[PDB]
Amino acid sequence: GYTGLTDEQAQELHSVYMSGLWLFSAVAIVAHLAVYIWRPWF
Amino acid sequence: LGYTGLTDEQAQELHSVYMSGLWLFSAVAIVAHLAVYIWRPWF
Amino acid sequence: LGYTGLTDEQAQELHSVYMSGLWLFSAVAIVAHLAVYIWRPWF
Amino acid sequence: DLGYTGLTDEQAQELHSVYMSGLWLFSAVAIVAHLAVYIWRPWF
Amino acid sequence: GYTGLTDEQAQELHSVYMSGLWLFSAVAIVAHLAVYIWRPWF
Amino acid sequence: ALLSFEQKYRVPGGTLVGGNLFDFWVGPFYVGFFGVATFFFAALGIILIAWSAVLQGTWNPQLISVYPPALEYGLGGAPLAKGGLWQIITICATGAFVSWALREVEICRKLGIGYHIPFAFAFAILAYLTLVLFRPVMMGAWGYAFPYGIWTHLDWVSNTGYTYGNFHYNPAHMIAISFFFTNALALALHGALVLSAANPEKGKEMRTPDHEDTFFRDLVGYSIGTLGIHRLGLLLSLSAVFFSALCMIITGTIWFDQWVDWWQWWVKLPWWANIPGGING
Amino acid sequence: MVGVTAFGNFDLASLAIYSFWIFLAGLIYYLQTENMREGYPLENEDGTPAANQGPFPLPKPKTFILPHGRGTLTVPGPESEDRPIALARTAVSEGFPHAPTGDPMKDGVGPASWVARRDLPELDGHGHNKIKPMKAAAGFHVSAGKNPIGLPVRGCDLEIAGKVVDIWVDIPEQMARFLEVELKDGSTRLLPMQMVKVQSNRVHVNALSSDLFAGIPTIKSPTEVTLLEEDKICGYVAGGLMYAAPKRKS
Amino acid sequence: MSKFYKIWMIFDPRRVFVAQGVFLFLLAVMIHLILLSTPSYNWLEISAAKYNRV
Amino acid sequence: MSKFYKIWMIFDPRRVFVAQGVFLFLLAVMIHLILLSTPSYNWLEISAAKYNRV
Amino acid sequence: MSKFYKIWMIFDPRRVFVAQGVFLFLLAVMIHLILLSTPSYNWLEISAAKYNRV
Amino acid sequence: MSKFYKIWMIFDPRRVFVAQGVFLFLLAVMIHLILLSTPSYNWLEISAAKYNRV
Amino acid sequence: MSKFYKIWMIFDPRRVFVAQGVFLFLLAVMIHLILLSTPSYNWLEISAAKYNRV
Amino acid sequence: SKFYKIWMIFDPRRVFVAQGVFLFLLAVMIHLILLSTPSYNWLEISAAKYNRV
Amino acid sequence: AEYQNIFSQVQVRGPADLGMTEDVNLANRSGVGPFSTLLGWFGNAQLGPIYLGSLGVLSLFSGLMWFFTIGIWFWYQAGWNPAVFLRDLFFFSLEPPAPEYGLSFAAPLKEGGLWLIASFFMFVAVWSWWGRTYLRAQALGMGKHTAWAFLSAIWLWMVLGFIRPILMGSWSEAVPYGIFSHLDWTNNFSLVHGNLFYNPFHGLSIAFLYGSALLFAMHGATILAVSRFGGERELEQIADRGTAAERAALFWRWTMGFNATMEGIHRWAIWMAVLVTLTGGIGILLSGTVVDNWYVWGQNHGMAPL
Numbered sequence A, E: 001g002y003t004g005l006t007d008e009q010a011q012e013l014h015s016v017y018m019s020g021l022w023l024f025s026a027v028a029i030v031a032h033l034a035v036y037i038w039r040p041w042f
Numbered sequence B, C: 001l002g003y004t005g006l007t008d009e010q011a012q013e014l015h016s017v018y019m020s021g022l023w024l025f026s027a028v029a030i031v032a033h034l035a036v037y038i039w040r041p042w043f
Numbered sequence D: 001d002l003g004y005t006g007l008t009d010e011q012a013q014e015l016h017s018v019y020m021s022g023l024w025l026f027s028a029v030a031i032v033a034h035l036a037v038y039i040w041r042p043w044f
Numbered sequence F: 001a002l003l004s005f006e007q008k009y010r011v012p013g014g015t016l017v018g019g020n021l022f023d024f025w026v027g028p029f030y031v032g033f034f035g036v037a038t039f040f041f042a043a044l045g046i047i048l049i050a051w052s053a054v055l056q057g058t059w060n061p062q063l064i065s066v067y068p069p070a071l072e073y074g075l076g077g078a079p080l081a082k083g084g085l086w087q088i089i090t091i092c093a094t095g096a097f098v099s100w101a102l103r104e105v106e107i108c109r110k111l112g113i114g115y116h117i118p119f120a121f122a123f124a125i126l127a128y129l130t131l132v133l134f135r136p137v138m139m140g141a142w143g144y145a146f147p148y149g150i151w152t153h154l155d156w157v158s159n160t161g162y163t164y165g166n167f168h169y170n171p172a173h174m175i176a177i178s179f180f181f182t183n184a185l186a187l188a189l190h191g192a193l194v195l196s197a198a199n200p201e202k203g204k205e206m207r208t209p210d211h212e213d214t215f216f217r218d219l220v221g222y223s224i225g226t227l228g229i230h231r232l233g234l235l236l237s238l239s240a241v242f243f244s245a246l247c248m249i250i251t252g253t254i255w256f257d258q259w260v261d262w263w264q265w266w267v268k269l270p271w272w273a274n275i276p277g278g279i280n281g
Numbered sequence G: 001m002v003g004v005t006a007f008g009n010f011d012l013a014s015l016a017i018y019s020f021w022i023f024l025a026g027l028i029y030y031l032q033t034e035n036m037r038e039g040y041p042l043e044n045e046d047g048t049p050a051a052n053q054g055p056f057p058l059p060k061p062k063t064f065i066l067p068h069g070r071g072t073l074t075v076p077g078p079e080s081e082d083r084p085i086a087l088a089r090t091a092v093s094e095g096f097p098h099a100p101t102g103d104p105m106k107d108g109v110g111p112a113s114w115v116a117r118r119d120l121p122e123l124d125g126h127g128h129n130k131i132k133p134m135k136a137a138a139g140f141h142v143s144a145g146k147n148p149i150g151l152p153v154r155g156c157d158l159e160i161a162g163k164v165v166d167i168w169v170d171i172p173e174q175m176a177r178f179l180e181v182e183l184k185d186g187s188t189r190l191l192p193m194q195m196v197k198v199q200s201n202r203v204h205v206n207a208l209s210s211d212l213f214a215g216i217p218t219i220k221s222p223t224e225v226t227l228l229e230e231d232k233i234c235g236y237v238a239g240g241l242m243y244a245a246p247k248r249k250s
Numbered sequence H, I, J, K, L: 001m002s003k004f005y006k007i008w009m010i011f012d013p014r015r016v017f018v019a020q021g022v023f024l025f026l027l028a029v030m031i032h033l034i035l036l037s038t039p040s041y042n043w044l045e046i047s048a049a050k051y052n053r054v
Numbered sequence M: 001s002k003f004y005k006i007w008m009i010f011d012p013r014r015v016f017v018a019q020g021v022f023l024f025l026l027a028v029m030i031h032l033i034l035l036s037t038p039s040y041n042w043l044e045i046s047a048a049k050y051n052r053v
Numbered sequence N: 001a002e003y004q005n006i007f008s009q010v011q012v013r014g015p016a017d018l019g020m021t022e023d024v025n026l027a028n029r030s031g032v033g034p035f036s037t038l039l040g041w042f043g044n045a046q047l048g049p050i051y052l053g054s055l056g057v058l059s060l061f062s063g064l065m066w067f068f069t070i071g072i073w074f075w076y077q078a079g080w081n082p083a084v085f086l087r088d089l090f091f092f093s094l095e096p097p098a099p100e101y102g103l104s105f106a107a108p109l110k111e112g113g114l115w116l117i118a119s120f121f122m123f124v125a126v127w128s129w130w131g132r133t134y135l136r137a138q139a140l141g142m143g144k145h146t147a148w149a150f151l152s153a154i155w156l157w158m159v160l161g162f163i164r165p166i167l168m169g170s171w172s173e174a175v176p177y178g179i180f181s182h183l184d185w186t187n188n189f190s191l192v193h194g195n196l197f198y199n200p201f202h203g204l205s206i207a208f209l210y211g212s213a214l215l216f217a218m219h220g221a222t223i224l225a226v227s228r229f230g231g232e233r234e235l236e237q238i239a240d241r242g243t244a245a246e247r248a249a250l251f252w253r254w255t256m257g258f259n260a261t262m263e264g265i266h267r268w269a270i271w272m273a274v275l276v277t278l279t280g281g282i283g284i285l286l287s288g289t290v291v292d293n294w295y296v297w298g299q300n301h302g303m304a305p306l
């Protein structure tokens, strides 16, 4: 494509980016659960 | 992906040392937060 | 890697001297902080 | 290379010796001045 | 005729875009149902 | 005268009015139809200012003031001792300025160059006419214009500004001040850069435009260029004068209150109008 | 220090203002003398030195060293305007115009004047030619605006005089300096960008009529323009604004 | 209906994606702020009144 | 569905990552500051009231 | 997670470390100053009131 | 840990030392000024009140 | 350490010496100015009060 | 018919961009005007109906 | 119509110019940024490369900390509310200590200490940038006209923030860090000292600001008017005078009886610009220290009726 990346390069890059995204979201989910138990907003 | 002329093994080495520094920083921060929380909890 | 053109031995020697400087600075700072805490504790 | 500035190890060591002589002179005068001021009017 | 994309490339790109749009719409629909059960606006 | 290269440039033509009737030079000056008009208007204005000084009773140049008619006269004529001399001097000044611009147009045509200089002078003439003609006519009285005195026109500036509280809060005034300040900064930088390229460290060769571009790229990361700096200067000066004329033409005609109160529209926007805290909460 | 006066009402503010008046007199003297490094001493209409030289003396000479082995310039110095000027005075009295004794565009007098500059190309900071044809310039391309290459060129007589074949770009400043225009006879001329108006379907040159395009001075090398050639071309084109007036709006 | 993919033959993917992301974010922020402004849908004040936190 | 990995074929990873980091940090800072300015969710003031620290 | 290292094949380590250091320092200073402006967490005023200093 | 020295592989020593000195100097001055601002730690005022000076 | 002398093999002596001169001059002026601005350490006012000169 | 000749004068990219901007602005305007009138302010109608305020 | 040479008709792009080397440390020069067509319609399109050295690092960190201190004070003043921050952004202010603290450093953080911290940051940033302007010209072999022209503005800045507050004996005399608040400070400065119109050096500063606008409109118009003869290449016209310089000189000689050179016009420019702040610093330094009422002073000096 425009970036010139190969297909396997896109596979690996998206795999790593998604792993980071899932780690960030898991931490965010735990934080939101802790806040909601501490002081719910609903 | 060769964006910076950096080999795979060099990336592994640099990440290893960077994460060593990151975990030292995080351990110091955890101890500091524990001391502050024992001194004056914020919850 | 390498960008500034330093060998392994050169980097090790420079790091040793920098670490010596950092330890002297930190030792003086620790002595100063202990003296101030004895004079007027901030906790 | 052995450095960026273009000084031989011996040139750098001689210059550092003279620099530390000057630094110790300045620091001795400052120490005497601080001792005199503290005796005259302490700040602790 | 400006991007130079072929028929197969355009179809693949639109298929991925549609998958993303349906995922976004499904998440939004679930969120809207949750809000409506919480506080209906009708 | 004549400069060493002047002789080949002194040719007939380029005159809007008069043909060869006034196509000559007095010393270095070029005279034309508008040169003769400029001389007459300037001489009459200066002589009438001296006569106004005689009537006023002072010969101190810093105390001489020619005052416009009172507000009671409206837009009509006033006795020469009260405001008529001011009106005649204002007509003479307008004639002198417009004839100066047209003489510059004639000189531009004779020299085969652009008309950027008369066009840029027309902006200053328009600001002057805003202060003496357009704003007083809109407001309904010649007495809203400023007097012709070295320190009394500053009194007019102060009084007009404080009619509306602190005049700093006029927004077009803010824009014009920003343009004036940026223009002075750019003039300093441009003069300094050209002089530093042409006058290097002693014993060194003249520097090129490449060095100028390199120096401001090293300093701020951008260089506007040799053409860009002169375009920027023209636009900065003309924008400053344009926004000055605008801030004065809106003042007392569509805005009659303290300019500080104008900014409450942003504070009182409905979404943050009533949030407690800060300065206005 | 408020109200403290040495004499009369003379305080530090009065001292400062009078000191500044002295300084400003000196500074204005310096500034006026710095600007007498070209065109002085003044001379009569026959070239002899003038009786009146003004109130400011000539400044002590200064020297520029030129960047690329181009020599050394001393100002103020002897003047160089020795080319013949085809002008005859229209009056015995001083201060009256000198009329052309031929074709002013060809003779380079009046608004069509040019100065005998160096017959060498202007160089950038690296010693290469400052102005180069775009096709000769490596990597240069049109990045915005209408591309004038290929457009027909129309004179002030509303007639086509040629077509644009190239753009002569200024390599350091990265700006277009000249348009190369091919004429009917297959030769080309350079026209400054400041004197042309690029439109949607044509390039309009208001200074010159269609018959005055062949009279534009030609450059020696097809890929190189000198300061002298640039000066001649620009002078011709700008003198067209006044000496091609009878051929307008046709 | 079965030919919308040809939009991508006329519109560059980068510009389309950037524009759509910016538009989506701005629309979401506007709707969230509108809900926050109305006292009947401001969830923070709703919970504060529900649990007597002030 | 599982073909999102082509997004990096169109968009430069460098610009995408930098923009995403900036956006995420700014959004988090804005949410934190909104909560801090809210009297019912200012955790420092809540703890101060809970532990009688003023 | 065991593959994050190749981020160094995308981003310049020098740029990343400079920006990260600046960001971390500014965040730490912001947090410390917010704590100082908080009456219940200004350790200097807490110790002044505790030891009857000012 | 026992591999840090390779900062000097990728970072020019002069730049690092200059930036570190700038940072240390600015931080030290800021901390001293904050201490002078607090009445309970302004050592000059403390000694003035301790020794009954002006 | 006994090997600080190689700091001169990295940094230009002229620049280091000029930086130290400027830094020391400004630090000394700053400290003297703070002392003068402190009424309890203004030595001219202290001598005026001690010797009854005003 | 024969309206397809409109794709002989204007660039389709510009046509689509302009039409999208037009439609979004029109929809935003109409929704905001509906929110302006209390008669068709569904948030306020819901608040009144359920006694939320 | 007629091309007035204000906006380019055609933009041409080539390889980015990396600048001259001379005696510049090329390791401290960054890479070239992108090309801006929007900027290229008016001047050069190329952005960068920039030079970042020791003084550059010091100046950037100091100025960043100055901005950060002011901004975090503003955020505290808003109660950490972003909406309040946007509503009252022009109404926030970091004020100097109160006058009862004099020149001492004992003012609290919310009552003058934070202003002192920010002022130290600004001091370091501005003087570092001055040293940078000097050294960047030194590296290229250029004269130091930019450094000494910047010193003229630094003079007024020092008088406003440092010198006059010290001579007046309090930090409260200094300028607050805010948009509307420094305008309020300016107005109150004029009101407290009588009328600043009747300060002769305020009048000189105004004369030189007006003359800067005058002169640089004249110069820009003149260079655009002779740009058809390559008049914007002013260095080459200094080295080798062409018909552009001659026509530019003759226009002004025929108009107002005297002219300049292609070099000396920039001497006029630099002096007219620097004299603004040169006279302004003296005018501010004489306010309160020498003259407390400028209208009465003008009355006693023949400037106002008695």
Ligand code: BCL
Residues within 6 Å of the ligand: F046, F049, F128, F131, F146, F150, F151, F153, F154, F157, N197, N202, N203, N204, N206, N207, N208, N210, N211, N214
């Ligand atoms: C612009 C909006 C304001 C205004 C507010 C200010 C303020 C505020 C100040 C001045 C100041 C000046 N103003 Mg004023 N001024 C206004 C309109 C004018 C008009 C006009 C025809 O519009 C002129 C002639 C002037 C002229 C003057 C000078 C006395 C002085 C220097 C300005 C300068 O050098 O500019 C740049 C131009 C040059 C450098 C070229 C040279 C200008 C020469 C010196 C003009 C001299 C004029 C002469 C005394 C009278 C002309 C006719 C005589 C019979 C020959 N003012 C109006 C109403 N002006 C200042 C001052 O010190 O006054 C005491 C000052 O502080």
Ligand code: BCL
Residues within 6 Å of the ligand: F157, F181, F184, N126, N153, N154, N156, N157, N160, N185, N186, N187, N189, N190, N191, N195, N196, N197, N201, N202, N205, N206, N207, N209, N276, N277, N279, N280, N281, N283, N284
């Ligand atoms: C009621 C309002 C008052 C008044 C009170 C003041 C006060 C108070 C002052 C002036 C001064 C000035 N006034 Mg006054 N002034 C009045 C009315 C006027 C009128 C008018 C027509 O009414 C005019 C045109 C002026 C015009 C001027 C200027 C001539 C002069 C400002 C020079 C300058 O450029 O400073 C701008 C330049 C600086 C302040 C220096 C900047 C240099 C520093 C180093 C910049 C650093 C930048 C920083 C690091 C930020 C970096 C950001 C990033 C780079 C983005 N005054 C009246 C009567 N005026 C000033 C002066 O000096 O005159 C004596 C001044 O102090």
Ligand SMILES: CC[C@H]1c2cc3[nH]c4c(c3C)C(=O)[C@H](C(=O)OC)c4c3nc(cc4[nH]c(cc(n2)[C@@H]1C)c(C(C)=O)c4C)[C@@H](C)[C@@H]3CCC(=O)OC/C=C(\C)CCC[C@H](C)CCC[C@H](C)CCCC(C)C
Residues within 6 Å of the ligand: F038, F041, F042, F043, F044, F045, F046, F049, F089, F092, F093, F096, F097, F100, F104, F117, F118, F120, F121, F122, F123, F124, F125, F147, F148, F149, F150, F153, F237, F238, F241, N210, N213, N214, N217, N218, N221, N255, N256
């Ligand atoms: C528009 C952008 C700026 C600008 C531009 C500009 N000014 C220009 C030009 C340009 C491009 C010229 O070409 C023209 C010129 O030739 O300059 C040397 C000029 C000029 N701008 C001048 C002055 C000037 N410009 C000013 C401002 C500005 N000029 C703007 C900021 C000011 C201010 C702010 O006060 C002044 C004083 C002159 C030096 C010159 C025009 C000379 C002229 O008009 O000559 C013919 C007229 C006379 C010889 C004098 C006539 C006198 C009257 C008959 C009586 C007095 C009337 C006057 C109103 C009294 C004032 C009393 C008190 C207010 C002091």
Ligand SMILES: CC[C@H]1c2cc3[nH]c4c(c3C)C(=O)[C@H](C(=O)OC)c4c3nc(cc4[nH]c(cc(n2)[C@@H]1C)c(C(C)=O)c4C)[C@@H](C)[C@@H]3CCC(=O)OC/C=C(\C)CCC[C@H](C)CCC[C@H](C)CCCC(C)C
Residues within 6 Å of the ligand: F181, F182, F184, F185, F188, F189, F192, F219, F220, N059, N060, N062, N063, N064, N065, N066, N067, N122, N125, N126, N127, N129, N130, N133, N146, N147, N149, N150, N151, N152, N153, N273, N274, N275, N276, N277
């Ligand atoms: C002769 C008097 C006039 C004058 C002259 C003048 N000014 C000058 C000069 C000169 C000759 C310079 O050489 C100098 C300069 O550099 O000009 C370009 C300057 C200058 N005059 C300036 C401003 C200025 N001049 C003014 C006025 C004037 N200057 C007078 C009219 C004014 C006014 C009217 O208020 C201002 C505001 C600057 C543009 C510049 C000096 C800049 C300077 O010292 O900067 C220091 C930096 C700071 C204190 C703030 C930094 C803020 C940043 C947010 C820092 C952090 C950045 C961040 C790390 C970036 C990260 C990026 C990555 C994440 C991608």
Ligand SMILES: CC(C)=CCC/C(C)=C/C=C/C(C)=C/C=C/C(C)=C/C=C/C=C(C)/C=C/C=C(\C)CC/C=C(\C)CCC=C(C)C
Residues within 6 Å of the ligand: A009, A012, A013, A014, A016, A017, A018, A019, A020, A021, A024, B001, H025, H028, H029, H032, H033, I024, J003, J004, J005, J006, J007, J008, J010
């Ligand atoms: C080349 C190879 C092989 C490998 C390279 C190595 C690589 C790539 C390493 C990188 C690994 C890492 C750390 C990746 C990290 C990824 C992360 C954190 C992703 C996070 C994504 C988060 C997302 C979308 C969040 C979106 C949220 C949105 C819209 C919210 C919108 C909110 C609104 C509208 C506010 C509404 C409320 C109010 C206004 C009050």
Ligand SMILES: CC(C)=CCC/C(C)=C/C=C/C(C)=C/C=C/C(C)=C/C=C\C=C(C)\C=C\C=C(/C)CC/C=C(\C)CCC=C(C)C
Residues within 6 Å of the ligand: L030, N067, N068, N070, N071, N072, N074, N116, N117, N119, N120, N122, N123, N157, N158, N159, N160, N161, N162, N175, N176, N177, N178, N179, N182
């Ligand atoms: C969103 C985020 C995160 C951030 C937002 C950041 C924001 C909003 C920033 C707003 C910044 C604003 C408004 C700034 C406005 C500034 C203005 C008008 C300034 C005007 C004039 C200032 C002047 C003369 C200052 C002069 C100071 C000088 C000579 C020197 C002072 C030196 C001193 C006093 C040193 C004292 C200390 C020691 C001796 C140790």
Ligand SMILES: CCCCCCCCCCCCO[C@@H]1O[C@H](CO)[C@@H](O[C@H]2O[C@H](CO)[C@@H](O)[C@H](O)[C@H]2O)[C@H](O)[C@H]1O
Residues within 6 Å of the ligand: G007, G008, G009, G010, G015, G018, G019, G022, G023, N300, N302
């Ligand atoms: C760079 C050079 C540095 C040194 C500069 C030295 C400059 C010295 C200049 C001295 C000029 C003195 O100028 C003269 O001062 C006296 C001081 O009262 C002024 O004052 C005089 O007249 C006024 C007006 O009638 C009276 O109110 C006043 O009582 C009387 O003393 C004069 O009006 C002025 O003409």
Ligand SMILES: [Fe+3]
Residues within 6 Å of the ligand: F190, F194, F230, N219, N223, N234, N266
């Ligand atoms: Fe110039």
